[PDB]
Amino acid sequence: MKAVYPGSFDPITLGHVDIIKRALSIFDELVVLVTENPRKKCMFTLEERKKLIEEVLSDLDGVKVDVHHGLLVDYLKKHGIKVLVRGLRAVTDYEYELQMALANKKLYSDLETVFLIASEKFSFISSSLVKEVALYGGDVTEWVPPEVARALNEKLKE
Amino acid sequence: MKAVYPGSFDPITLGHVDIIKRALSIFDELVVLVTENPRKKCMFTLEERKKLIEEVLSDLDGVKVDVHHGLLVDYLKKHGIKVLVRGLRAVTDYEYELQMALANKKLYSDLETVFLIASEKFSFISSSLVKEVALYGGDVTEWVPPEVARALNEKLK
Amino acid sequence: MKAVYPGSFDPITLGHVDIIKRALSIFDELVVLVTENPRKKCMFTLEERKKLIEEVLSDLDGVKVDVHHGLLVDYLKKHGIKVLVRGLRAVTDYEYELQMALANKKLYSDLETVFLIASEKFSFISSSLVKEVALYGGDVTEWVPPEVARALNEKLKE
Amino acid sequence: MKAVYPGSFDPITLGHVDIIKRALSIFDELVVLVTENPRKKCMFTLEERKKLIEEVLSDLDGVKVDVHHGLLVDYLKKHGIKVLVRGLRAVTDYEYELQMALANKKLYSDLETVFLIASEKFSFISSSLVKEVALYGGDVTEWVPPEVARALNEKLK
Amino acid sequence: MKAVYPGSFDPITLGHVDIIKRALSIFDELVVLVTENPRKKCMFTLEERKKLIEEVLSDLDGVKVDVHHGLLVDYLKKHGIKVLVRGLRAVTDYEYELQMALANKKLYSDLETVFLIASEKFSFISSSLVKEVALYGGDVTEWVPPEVARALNEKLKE
Amino acid sequence: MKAVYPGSFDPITLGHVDIIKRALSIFDELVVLVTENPRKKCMFTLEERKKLIEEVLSDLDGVKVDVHHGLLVDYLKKHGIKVLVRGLRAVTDYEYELQMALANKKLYSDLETVFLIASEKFSFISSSLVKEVALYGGDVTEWVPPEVARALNEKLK
Ligand SMILES: CC(C)(COP(=O)(O)O)[C@H](O)C(=O)NCCC(=O)NCCS
Ligand SMILES: CC(C)(COP(=O)(O)O)[C@H](O)C(=O)NCCC(=O)NCCS
Ligand SMILES: CC(C)(COP(=O)(O)O)[C@H](O)C(=O)NCCC(=O)NCCS
Ligand SMILES: CC(C)(COP(=O)(O)O)[C@H](O)C(=O)NCCC(=O)NCCS
Ligand SMILES: CC(C)(COP(=O)(O)O)[C@H](O)C(=O)NCCC(=O)NCCS
Ligand SMILES: CC(C)(COP(=O)(O)O)[C@H](O)C(=O)NCCC(=O)NCCS
Known part of the structure; x- marks a missing residue:
């Protein structure tokens, strides 16, 4: 069964990769969906983020990466996907997640948003955080794949 | 007794209308006050918002709609109003509401901020939310009065 | 207009007294209702609590003190009262209050639960806290009326 | 794929039944597991609760109801189940759920705890709540299956 | 400078040991104070707990382990200690910690309660949790010192 | 022992001054560090803020005021400081403070972030808040030092 893992992935971290790998143990097919969050000004374009994620996930089976500019549930409805996966951390705005899950369900009544728990190591x-630390030249190597560390480093020069 | 229900109402939703109606069961006179929130960029002007609210509330007795550009407690002091009504939702920033209630009371010692609980249906x-969904062409009809759905649709063109 | 301010008041504190005083600015008649909380083992009997509160509020106009053993909304329906007042503190379980308000309104549709914010000094x-500190012989004089400090002291000798 | 939906179910509510029906949209087999909560004193025995749930879910395909007295992950390990489903409400202790998910994953590395959101109607x-209202003779009919309203009625005699 | 780290320590976990070690990098003298929490029924007696802690911290310099049955600030006042150290976890009741800090500062005006953050690994x-798991025969080896795992095992047979 | 109290101090309030005075009873040397928060647009420059704080703290022994534009831990590493002090209020985003303490300790393993509790009067x-109220011409006298009230009044003209 198919699920979508939607997010800004700006950039993708090792926490996200963990959720993806774990989600694949429940859903045979996963779409990692780089989607526009209108409450964020992003560092990387949607396509820059897609390419990064593709490099990072390059040898996982069952995962496809895509982008979406509009209403999330319209992506799912169009592709006949009825499950959304999201991660929950200690630093997650829980009411925001609930609000969106409930709103999305109202807009798409067949929808199920399913949450996985971040491991302790990625829960904070x-x-x-990654961008803030990289932008002041701190080491983010333990939080992001090496592809992303390079990408961040370049963007901090450009 | 007179109370002010202050808010951005940008736009007014069914949740707001519910708090208005319920507040009127306690306070015989309610001023719905469209007030500037300096931490928000608003979709509709203060006066567009007043007009929507007036259309929406248009046969409710006991309600007046007004706008205010300055310090909220100044409106209440000038009009002799000593009660502020606000709604509490699951998604309400509770510390923000407390902070503001306490600051307002500091500024205006006779003030009481009184909170009503949003019903479950409006608690999230x-x-x-409404603007974000409308802006991507989603149906917000369950969350707003039809006057507002119309207004949002126009604004999105 | 009539309102009920229900609670365990076990014992009544200066924070409760403040909410009573303030609620009386809005509601002409206030019933302070000593109500059984089935989730607490109280220190003082319902009647001991009523008596302390009466001593403590003795020269406030507009306040009546009463006790109730049953379903809270039944007291209100019986007496034609449609408003419940509660205080909100930094240490309040917000979800519990919200749950109870919404349950009470489902049981009694005309009801409105109204909340006042505890002042900074009483918000924690x-x-x-009072009972625990008095139990170990600490001074609770800044948190409770003198009558209550006395009653606590006696109870911790018994 | 199999999942366990563990809980006190003391008693089962319409909120729990909603999660069960929805989980069955994802998991082909669901075990509703009446499990001992050591931080709670139950109203009904584990076996009373099992019987109630079996009455309530009687014509749902894909569900089994069972009881467990020990460590939750031991039941899952024993039966080769590696998914736990739980529901998230506005009134949920979020940090408790996270603690327990993380602890269970430590104890059983192949485990995944999966959370569904309770609908607005059942989020509070x-x-x-049901037991407390029932015990004072309040109507809990809109929150529990009729089977459970009956059982609560009896227990309170 | 002397500080007290007060707690139930029932039993001491690796999370507590981490806070102790780290607090010693700031305070040259630390009193680990096994103190009675009247809102808990403890598994081990105060003396059992002291003994376990002493076994566990046996080769830390600068630490003393003690017990207290009364009001916490009375111990501190008696011994001229003006700093209390507590740990903050993702699962900490933050309002309970604040309440108690503020209450303690009210009862002992010179006191400062200082909080350290638990590491990610001990934050949940x-x-x-340890006692619940052990009671049902689960492995608590990663969460407690071996002395404590042993003590827990024995207690679960007794 | 030396500690840094880092913050935007935009502007410094009486709550910050209270944390400074109290931190000085534990740490013999305190650096009040005006540091860039990249998630905020500041009202005052870093140097305006440094000068305000210096006026305000002028007769406190043991305190130095400084500014830093980069990674906070780099300031501490450079100066051999291994303690960071922060204040906890009722209105503090706890998760944010935790996140940053943990991140800082990852970047600088010798570091301890130590939290003091704001007194009740400063906890909200x-x-x-101060800026918002001053902006609308409200009295912020009870929340900031008179030097800061003045500075805010000027800024608003
Ligand atoms: C990107 C995201 C999925 C949120 O993910 P994020 O927390 O990683 O930013 C986004 O907010 C989103 O859903 N955008 C599309 C707009 C939409 O469908 N719904 C918003 C109303 S629920
Ligand atoms: C509009 C509102 C009441 C907030 O309402 P909102 O939550 O609907 O945006 C506003 O923040 C406000 O009070 N605005 C300007 C006046 C003022 O006094 N602000 C300081 C509050 S301490
Ligand atoms: C005593 C109290 C008012 C709670 O107040 P408290 O927070 O002071 O203890 C009580 O819990 C209550 O409302 N009712 C007792 C029985 C009842 O009505 N229970 C169901 C409420 S939904
Ligand atoms: C605690 C509970 C009964 C379920 O919780 P509920 O009461 O919230 O429905 C849970 O299902 C459980 O696991 N009980 C058995 C003991 C166990 O495994 N404990 C360690 C949990 S980390
Ligand atoms: C031991 C502890 C600090 C709590 O620690 P714990 O949270 O680890 O159980 C305790 O509750 C305590 O202080 N007990 C003695 C009673 C007291 O002095 N004060 C509480 C009044 S603020
Ligand atoms: C960002 C901030 C100034 C926050 O202080 P504030 O809460 O007073 O704004 C913080 O003190 C800080 O660390 N800033 C510098 C940038 C940095 O080092 N960021 C990484 C945070 S882990």
Whole structure:
């Protein structure tokens, strides 16, 4: 069965990769969906983020990476996908997640949003933390794949 | 007794209408006050928002709609109003509401901020949700009055 | 207009007294209702609590003190009261309040639960904290009326 | 694929039944597991709760109801089940759920705890609310299956 | 400078040991104070707990282990200690810690309660979790010192 | 022992001054570090903020005021400081403080971030609140030092 893992992935972290790998143990097919969050000004374009994720996930079976500019549930409806996966961390805004899950279900009544728990080691990181630290030249090697560390380093020069 | 229900109402949703109606069961006179939130960029002007609300509330007795550009407690002091009504949702920033209630009371010692609980159906909606969904062409009809759905549709063109 | 301010008041604190005083600015008649909480083992009997509160509020106009053993909304329906007042503190279980308000409104549709915010000075106290400190002989004089400090002291000799 | 939906179910509510029906959209087999919570004193025995749930879910395909007295992950390991399903409400202790998910995953590395969101209607109810209202003679009919309203009625005599 | 690390320590976990080690990098003298929490029924007596802690910390310099049955601030006042150290975890009741810090500062105005953050790995563990798991015969080896795993095993036979 | 109290101090409030005074009873040397928060647009420059704080703390022994534009831990590493002090309020985003403490300790393994509790009177105030109220011409006298009230008044003209 198919699921979508939607997110800004700006950039993708090792926490995200963990959720992807784990989600694949429940859903045979996973779409990692780089989707526009209108409440964020992103560092990387949607396509830059897609290419990064593809490099990073390159030898996982069962995973496809895509981008979406519109209403999330329209992507799912169009492709006949009825499951959304999201990760929950200690630093997650829980009411935000609930609000969106409930809103999405109202817009798409067949939808199920399924949450996995971040492991302890990734429960307090975020893309935002990663970018902030990299932008001041800190080491983010333990939080992101090497592809992403390179990409961040370049963007901090450009 | 008179109370002010202050908010961005950008736009007013069914959750807001519910708090208005319920607040009127306690306070015989309610001022719905469209007030500037300096931490928000608003979709509709203060006056567009007043007009929607007036259309929406248009046969409710006991309600007046107004706008205010300054310090909220100044409106209440000038009009002799000593009660502020606000709604509490599952998705409400509780510390923000407390902070603001306490700051307002510091500024205006006779003030009481009184909170009502949003019903379950409205406890996870907000104007922000409504606008985001409308802006991507989703149906917001379950969350807003039809006057507002119309207004949002126009604004999105 | 009539309102009920229901609670364990076990014992009543200066924080409760503040909410009573403030609620009386909005509601002409206030019933302070000593109500059984089935999730607590109380220190004082319902009647001991009623008596302390009466001593403590003795010269406030507009306040009546009463006790109730049953379903809270039944007290209100019986007496034609449609407003419940509760205080909100930094240490309040917000979800429990919200749950109870919404349950109470499902049981009694005309009901409105209204919340006042505890002042900063009382926003981190509770009857529980008071009892625990008095139990170990600490001074609770800044948190409770003198009558209550007295009653606590006696109870911790018994 | 099999999952276990573990809980006190003391008693089962319409919120739990909703999660069960929805989980069955994802998992082909669901074990509803009446499991001992050592931080709770139950109203009904584990076996009373099992019988109630079996009455309630009687014509749902794909569900089994069972009881477990020990460590949750031991039941899953024993039966080769590697998914746990839980529900998330507005009134859920989030940090408790995370703790327990993380602890269970430590104890059983192949485990995944999967969370579904309770609908708005069921996001502010709990078994504990139901029992407290029932015990004071309040109507809990909109929160529990009729079977459970009956059982609560009897127990309170 | 002297500090007290007060707690139930029922039993001491690796999370507590981490806080102790780290607090010693700031405070040259640390008193680990096994103190009675009246809102808990403890598994081990205060003396059992002291003994376990002493076994566990046996070759740490700068640490003393003690017990206290009364009001915490009375121990501190008696011994001229003005700093209390507590740990903060993702599963900490933050309002309970604040309440108690503020209450303690009210009862002893010179006191400062200082909080350290638990590491990610210990941020979701508690003595309570440990005891629940052990009680049902689960491995708590990664969460407690071996002395404690042994003590827990014995207690679960007794 | 030396500690850094880092913050935007935009502007410094009486709550910050209280944490400074109290931190000085534990740490014989305190550096108040005006540091860039990249998630905020500041009202005052780093140097305006440094100068305010210096006026405000002028007769406190043991305190130095400084500014830093980069990674916070780099300031500490450079100066051999291994303690960071922060304040906890009712209105503090706890998860954010935790996240940053843990991240900082990852980047600088000798570091301890140590938290003091804001007194009740300061537990619901913030520089943001102050700015918002001052902006609308409200009295912020009870929340900031008179030097800061003045500075805010100027800025608003
Ligand atoms: C990108 C995301 C999925 C949120 O993910 P994020 O937390 O990784 O930013 C986004 O907010 C989203 O859903 N965008 C599309 C708009 C939409 O479908 N719904 C918003 C109303 S629920
Ligand atoms: C509009 C509102 C009442 C907030 O309502 P909102 O949550 O609907 O945005 C606003 O923040 C407000 O009070 N605005 C300007 C006046 C003021 O006094 N602000 C300081 C509050 S301490
Ligand atoms: C005593 C109290 C008011 C709670 O107040 P407390 O927080 O002061 O203990 C009580 O829990 C209550 O409302 N009712 C007792 C019985 C009842 O009505 N229970 C169901 C409420 S949904
Ligand atoms: C605690 C509970 C009964 C279920 O919780 P519920 O009461 O929230 O429905 C849970 O299912 C459980 O696991 N009980 C058995 C003991 C166990 O495995 N404990 C360690 C959990 S980390
Ligand atoms: C031991 C502890 C610090 C709590 O520690 P714990 O949270 O590890 O159980 C305890 O509750 C305590 O202080 N006990 C004695 C009673 C007291 O002095 N104060 C509570 C009044 S603020
Ligand atoms: C960002 C901030 C100034 C926050 O302080 P504030 O809460 O007073 O704004 C913080 O003190 C800090 O660390 N800033 C510098 C940038 C940095 O080092 N960021 C990585 C945070 S892990």
